[PDB]
Design a binder for this molecule. Structure first.
Ligand SMILES: N[C@@H](CCC(=O)N[C@@H](CSC1C([N+](=O)[O-])=CC([N+](=O)[O-])C=C1[N+](=O)[O-])C(=O)NCC(=O)O)C(=O)O
Ligand SMILES: N[C@@H](CCC(=O)N[C@@H](CSC1C([N+](=O)[O-])=CC([N+](=O)[O-])C=C1[N+](=O)[O-])C(=O)NCC(=O)O)C(=O)O
Lengths: 208, 208
């Protein structure tokens, strides 16, 4: 019953598509061209002048996380209790803080400090490796014994980092095995090798 | 009760202190200082190298939005349903992107951005005024007919721009009657005039 609006990019939507495609779900897509947003026909119709946009039938939503937390809750991808759902919310704000830092490296400074960003990236990644070493051994998901929407938000932030700085996971043993076992999950490994996701750019400016 | 470990400023905890003061809660502050945080060991033990940290007993926490959704779903401020609970995450994530850009100029360019961040404001609060006129007539809370942590964070976001650009709400009626109707709330009008709030810096660098 879903629909997703966005530009023909991977951007802030590549993570909510991985959970829908791996959850055994299905959805329709809608798209905005590079010029339909250069018109006003859609930037004023949005609650913040931006996309992704979502539909759940009679509902609509904005913000990449309101949709990621909305499908975790309506699909049981939010933890098992009030506290796992707090440690599943703690990984996501950190995961949304380092991507908010990656969005500025790919759109406002990739040529004047794109190497000062890979220089401090290990420490930006130690935190999540520190939580897996503190999990069931790192042999599970990022929280509890079940997967959550935080796993698809970190698995993409970890997937798009292996592309701007190859070998950024060689110091993090557990993130290297957790990022290899989730892309191997049957329905998501089928979505990563598809043209639907293999043919769009990670970003809108074309850099990576 | 709970505990808050943060710098002697209002910064990121100012909304949960209004949530814990307006919700009949009690708590302790573990004030921290630039002489204590520069000592190192307190920041090297944080999960991301930052504050505030917070607790509910054995459960520790970091990330200010995680503490607002965790006190939100534990205090009964997270919606009456799943779709109102996502319509609350939509107002909190937007109040966080405005608060995410109000925090970068205050600490990274207050002398070259305070003349452009203020003419770009009108357009940043319209959404929030549109959501009130789009619910209960705007005579209630930002979402549903009940209060939420999204409401304790959008009010703090409106009390601070009222300090960087006083008179920024003069064209946003429902937003001007809502920042006074929430400050009139009994236990919130009593804590907001209290010493631990008024003698605290909104920010931690001098500007505002
Ligand atoms: N916090 C919100 C932020 C949403 C957001 O930033 N949306 C951007 C797309 S992201 C990114 C991007 N960008 O950050 O500026 C621009 C882009 N593009 O094609 O022009 C594509 C992007 N992408 O990630 O694919 C947008 O609507 N941009 C239109 C505008 O600003 O007028 C969320 O998580 O949903
Ligand atoms: N997403 C996290 C971010 C938490 C965070 O940014 N904490 C900052 C305080 S915020 C802000 C601030 N800042 O953003 O850099 C610095 C500050 N100070 O006194 O030095 C005070 C701040 N404040 O808001 O009062 C911190 O620990 N800073 C220490 C460090 O970076 O080493 C959350 O929401 O909790």
């Amino acid at each position: 019953p879903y629909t997703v609006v966005y530009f023909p990019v991977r951007g802030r939507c590549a993570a909510l598509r991985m959970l829908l495609a791996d959850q055994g779900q299905s959805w329709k897509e809608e798209v905005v061209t590079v010029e339909t947003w250069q018109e006003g026909s859609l930037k004023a119709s949005c609650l913040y002048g931006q996309l992704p946009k979502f539909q759940d039938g009679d509902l609509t939503l904005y913000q990449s996380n309101t949709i990621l937390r909305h499908l975790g809750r309506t699909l049981g991808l939010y933890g098992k209790d009030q506290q796992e759902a707090a440690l599943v919310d703690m990984v996501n704000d950190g995961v949304e803080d380092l991507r908010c830092k990656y969005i500025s490296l790919i759109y406002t400074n990739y040529e004047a400090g794109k190497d000062d960003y890979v220089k401090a990236l290990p420490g930006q990644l130690k935190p999540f490796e520190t939580l897996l070493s503190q999990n069931q051994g790192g042999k599970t998901f990022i929280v509890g014994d079940q997967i959550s929407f935080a796993d698809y938000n970190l698995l993409d932030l970890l997937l798009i980092h292996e592309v701007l700085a190859p070998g950024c996971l060689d110091a993090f043993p557990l993130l290297s095995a957790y990022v290899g076992r989730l892309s191997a999950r049957p329905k998501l490994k089928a979505f990563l090798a598809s043209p639907e996701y293999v043919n769009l750019p990670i970003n809108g400016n074309g850099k990576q």
